[PDB]
């Protein structure tokens, strides 16, 4: 029953929690946990460093949509795909 706007607000709040943990240096002793936390923030540099796990540009697209644009509209997909 959740609206896309209620989802977007929970998603933004969760993203701010991820960002706060990164800024506090919570993961500074483990590069892999820090990299996973940067992936959760949709960090494009770290997503591209992990290209070999995705193998295709369309897997990379869907991971970008998951961590930056979870409420994406059909009409906007082409722009993100290109």
């Amino acid at each position: 029953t959740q609206t896309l706007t209620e989802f977007e607000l929970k998603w933004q709040h969760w993203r701010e929690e991820c960002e706060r943990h990164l800024q506090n240096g919570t993961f500074s002793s483990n590069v892999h946990m820090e990299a996973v936390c940067r992936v959760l923030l949709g960090d494009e540099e770290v997503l591209l460093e992990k290209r070999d796990l995705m193998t295709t540009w369309y897997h990379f697209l869907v991971s970008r949509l998951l961590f930056k644009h979870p409420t994406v509209k059909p009409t906007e997909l082409h722009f993100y795909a290109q």
């Binding site: 029953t1 959740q2 609206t3 706007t5 209620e6 607000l9 929970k10 709040h13």
Partner: protein, 447 residues
């Protein structure tokens, strides 16, 4: 017997008619929806309603509402291509409104996510004939919501949560409507229903359990909406509780027919409703919240607190105004009642249907008057309870000036006959001795 015949055919006739009502074409859809609206109204057994739900036709009809966003955008134009879509929408909303009147129907609509789908519609944010049309859209949507939930069961309280989500999702438009200085009865009805929904949905208990997944923020949003409701509610006292009352009632006198009379009646309705609900809300907040009883901070010398004194002065002034009007309305109702079958014969000397309509008008009068009655009973009660505990607290903890003003107004409360006809219709006098005890605590406190 008719229902037995509808059943007798089997879920076959019901399926064909309900499917065709959904997605046929224009006229046929409109008529099929109207037919469904009418059949579901005489559905004491509510079998048709069960079939519609189990066969998925009710869901399809609800999903099809998202279709009209584009239609509304095209319609806001000066020239309309076809009013056919408006009539389908009306038949559809009428049918849904009929289904929502049912205690179960309201639950089934909530399961089907009707409020969630209305919250996704952007047409409600396009406030501009075009303005009248935005008005009508608002009408149907909000209609269904409020009526449903209200006539809804106590167990389905989330109804209030979902409706509040709808009000918050369109906060700009809602605030614009609450700031509109409009003497039209419609605006008052909108305000009355909205204040009713806010009074039931905006319980600080809904914001604390809403932190499970939305969390620290959903509470602030909740507190924010509530604070706005509070300010807008208090602003209504200057509009309806000040020298502007006479101007709102005089601009409609350029033309007062029976229509205008009833309009003023329900203007009073609103005045009443919009706030009984708000007062209820205040009382509920005080009984659960208990007016920050735990806090030891002085209530009397960001917000302000003279605001309370103002509110007290205003509510004390409004009480006498409301009481005078309530008393005047009762006399008019008694005069309407006096008119007999003999009055129709005198008019004839159709006179009979004139009296049919006359009775219509007078019973509408009765409605409005009794509404006002309950409203003011409640008003009085609230003022009292509040002021009572208020002054209780104040006691220990300016006091002389307040006491002097209070004694003067309290004497002047004359009427100072509290009446007993609404009370003679209602049950026991909680205006009498409960109010008398409040007076002993307060008038004596003023002394």
């Amino acid at each position: 017997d008719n229902l037995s015949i509808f059943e007798s055919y089997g879920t076959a006739l019901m399926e064909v008619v309900c499917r065709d009502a959904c997605d046929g074409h224009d006229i046929g859809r409109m008529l099929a929806l109207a037919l469904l609206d009418r059949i579901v109204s005489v559905d004491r057994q509510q079998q048709w309603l069960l079939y519609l739900s189990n066969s998925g036709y009710l869901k399809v009809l609800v999903d099809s509402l998202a279709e009209d966003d584009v239609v509304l955008r095209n319609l806001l134009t000066p020239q309309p291509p076809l009013l056919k879509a408006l009539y389908i929408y009306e038949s559809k909303m009428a049918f849904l409104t009929r289904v929502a009147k049912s205690s179960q129907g309201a639950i089934e609509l909530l399961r089907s996510g009707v409020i969630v789908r209305l919250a996704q519609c952007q047409v409600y944010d396009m406030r501009p004939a075009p303005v009248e049309r935005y008005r009508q859209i608002l009408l149907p949507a909000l209609q269904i919501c409020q009526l449903i939930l209200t006539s809804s069961t106590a167990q389905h309280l989330q109804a209030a949560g979902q409706v509040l989500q709808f009000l918050v999702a369109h906060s700009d438009t809602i605030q614009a409507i609450l700031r509109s200085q409009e003497g039209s009865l419609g605006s008052l009805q909108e305000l009355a229903l909205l204040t009713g929904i806010i009074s039931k949905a905006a319980l600080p208990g809904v914001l604390n359990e809403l932190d499970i997944g939305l969390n620290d923020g959903s509470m602030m949003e909740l507190q924010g909406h509530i604070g706005r409701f509070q300010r807008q509610c208090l602003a209504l006292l200057n509009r309806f509780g000040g020298s502007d009352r006479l101007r709102q009632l005089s601009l409609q006198d350029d033309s007062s027919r029976l229509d205008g009379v009833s309009k003023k009646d329900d203007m009073e309705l609103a005045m009443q409703q919009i706030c009984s609900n708000v007062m209820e809300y205040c009382q509920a907040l005080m009984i659960q919240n208990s007016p920050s009883f735990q806090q030891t901070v002085c209530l009397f010398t960001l917000p302000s607190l003279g605001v309370v004194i103002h509110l007290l002065k205003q509510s004390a002034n409004n009480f006498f105004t409301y009481y005078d009007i309530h008393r005047q309305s009762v006399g008019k109702l008694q005069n309407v009642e006096q008119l007999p079958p003999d009055e129709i014969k005198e008019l004839c000397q159709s006179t009979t249907q004139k009296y049919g309509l006359a009775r219509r008008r007078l019973v509408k009068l009765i409605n409005s008057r009794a509404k006002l009655l309950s409203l003011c009973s409640y008003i009085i009660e609230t003022c009292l309870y509040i002021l009572w505990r208020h002054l209780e607290y104040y006691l220990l903890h300016q006091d002389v000036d307040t006491l002097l003003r209070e004694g003067a107004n309290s004497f002047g409360e004359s009427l100072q006959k509290r009446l007993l006809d609404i009370e003679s219709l209602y049950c026991k006098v909680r205006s009498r001795h409960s109010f008398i005890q409040a007076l002993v605590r307060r008038i004596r406190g003023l002394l």
